Design a protein around this ligand. Structure first.
Ligand code: HEM
Ligand code: HEM
Lengths: 362, 363
């Protein structure tokens, strides 16, 4: 139930232990007035300081003037902070506004088309994003709803995604969660304690070429549908061969324990783990932080199921792009389809109580 | 505690403690063969016994023959029972199959059209339901996914709804949950401790007319969207006047504490509490067991959120129908819309290890 500190050199919600629930929103900007947009970023930062400490925004949820709408919508009253983090990102499309064209980072690369992509344009892209993670879904919905309300007239929600359960780990000391295919997901990630690996693979550095982004990161979001009818009729051996790990323990093929190191030559040449491993990709390493979803039925008698994949990296060109390119022959492709995509530059942290989201850019 | 017993005179999931999360699924039957359907009910009961104890279905999720699909899909390995309950119900449309038309209970009444209804036919009705409630949403989803798999070829999933209430790890058990309008929700309800009130208002009795249903109950489900962005622009006074209770404490107007008994004459005539109260409805009293939902955002950027309303009662004609009829002029109607509906007869409990869901109906 405890609070996660909001201020720092980096934004929380990346290296932080992964919380149980997600509410992710992408917004488009509707104002052309730079000063008005700056005012919004400041007001949002002030609200985020309240929300992440379990307090109501503005003057509260009740006890004001009877004839005015309350400043806070009130549905998180009496709840703990529940490890809420709020992480903001800026999309490539933002940099066509407010005279920002020459400040777009090179590392904020547009993704190529990948074989098998079927991207819905309405649930792709976005001028900006807010990732809300918490252990209580009500706390996460409250945060997104109140930010959107404050932004009325300056921003609109483009698309959103809820995640009911995590499929990732930044804490190797704790149990690794399973995805809806029934396999542990998150064994070989980057841990929040691994400061050297975070500096090498996740945080942007001054020397990388974009000063305002120092201490930030780059985010790729992919909405992935899972063909569960097809998967659920596969044999146990087929399932294990797809990944290169056994289902019950999650050990590499031939080994006894989850955290034993993979021996790649024992895996099939199209096994997911073999293709995705840093040693297969010139050392490229990612911080994975995704969640499972189910959005009803598919209208054909079946449950809908998928994975909302999130990865953080120091440079999109040296992280997600080489790895996903190497997955062109993945055995897993038979059972999944990418149906949504977005990239964002995640700025540095809010240093103290006088700072504000995006201050290094604006 | 960690598990809820499966066996009993009544099914669990009605009077037993309210769990943090819901996965509710409605199913349509595709077979015409009565024997095949009975065999499914037996297989589903065997699976439910395993699932509610935190065990995998059948021979397990791994360690069987490599060339066979696993019996259990594996996504709940390592999780706890999580207070899982599985509650089955039968829709009016099931009774047009298997020669059952003369065994439909009179208390399983079709609902009338109510003012302002905008029902999506695709998210309404169903031959069967399974209500899966647990404190961990992955435990609930795993249960529905595996029942649907076991049934493939005999049933399909018609519609599915996820919901949430409180998070019990961080929120005290005695605190009333708030709904997404920011008001406390559940103050004046039937509690599972009230044995006599359950007998009077919730459980079907033998003398009610349908012997196979003795110890069962009747369920109404309504998916109710809230117009969140319109509500959030209303004044504090307007929101309180809609309900007849204050927002901070949830006390009735003119009183000081949440649990103070209401004085109906102090509320506005079309306030929700005044219209819904038993004294306004000839004594009609309901067990509410609903869950909030937030599904995402719609094509206009608005939040697709609301209340998945569930009510249990001894007879639909003397429970939900009179009360919802009385809400025709409710001040709350400005901010909500009913967009899905279904009714089910929930049979009696599974008595012991040799009994099965539906045994009193099928024989
Ligand atoms: C529905 C889609 C996916 C599923 C079900 C899935 C599943 C898994 C599983 C079960 C593991 C093994 C345990 C672990 O180390 O985490 C794994 C590893 C991994 N996955 Fe995926 N994955 C999916 C999509 C992706 C995508 C899109 C990428 C990147 C483009 C990716 C990158 C990785 C990486 C880098 C590893 C760790 C390899 C290593 O260093 O040992 N995965 N995945
Ligand atoms: C989105 C829809 C609804 C919302 C937000 C809502 C909200 C509330 C609230 C805040 C209360 C007061 C606290 C309490 O005693 O629980 C209440 C009471 C009540 N509601 Fe509703 N309600 C909704 C729909 C319905 C429907 C559809 C019915 C029945 C057909 C219903 C029946 C009642 C009853 C019987 C009470 C208790 C009144 C009493 O005995 O004091 N509600 N509701």
């Amino acid at each position: 139930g405890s609070a996660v500190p909001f201020h720092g050199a980096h934004q929380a919600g990346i290296a932080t232990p992964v919380q149980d629930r997600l509410h992710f929103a992408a917004f488009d900007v509707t104002t052309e007035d730079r000063a008005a947009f700056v005012a919004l970023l400041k007001e949002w930062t002030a609200a985020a300081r309240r929300l992440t400490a379990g307090h109501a925004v503005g003057e509260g949820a009740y006890g004001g003037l009877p004839e005015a709408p309350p400043d806070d919508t009130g549905e998180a009253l009496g709840l703990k902070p529940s490890r809420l983090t709020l992480t903001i990102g800026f999309g490539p499309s933002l940099f066509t506004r407010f005279g920002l064209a020459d400040l777009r980072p090179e590392a904020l690369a547009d993704l190529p088309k990948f074989p098998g992509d079927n991207l819905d344009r309405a649930r792709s892209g976005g001028d900006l994003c807010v990732q809300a993670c918490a252990d209580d879904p009500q706390v996460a919905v409250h945060a997104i709803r109140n930010l959107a309300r404050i932004g009325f007239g300056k921003v609109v929600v483009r698309w959103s995604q809820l995640g009911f359960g995590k499929t990732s780990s930044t804490t190797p000391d704790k149990q690794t969660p399973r995805n809806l295919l029934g396999f542990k997901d998150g064994t070989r990630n980057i841990a929040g304690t691994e400061k050297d690996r975070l500096d090498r693979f996740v945080w942007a550095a001054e020397k990388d070429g974009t000063p305002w982004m120092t201490g930030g990161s780059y985010l790729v979001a992919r909405r992935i549908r899972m063909h569960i009818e097809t998967w659920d009729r596969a044999s146990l051996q087929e399932q294990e061969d797809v990944f290169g790990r056994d289902k019950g323990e999650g050990a590499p093929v031939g080994k006894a324990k989850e955290r034993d190191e993979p021996f790649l030559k024992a895996m099939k040449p199209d096994a997911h783990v073999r293709l995705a491993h840093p040693d297969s990709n010139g050392g490229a390493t990612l911080l994975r932080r995704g969640y499972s979803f189910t959005d009803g039925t598919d209208g054909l008698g079946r449950l809908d199921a998928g994975l909302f994949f999130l990865a953080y990296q120091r440079d999109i060109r040296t992280g997600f792009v080489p790895v996903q390119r190497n997955l062109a022959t993945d055995a897993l492709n038979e059972y999944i389809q990418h149906v949504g995509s977005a990239v964002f530059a995640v700025p540095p942290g809010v240093r103290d109580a006088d700072d504000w989201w995006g201050s290094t850019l604006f």
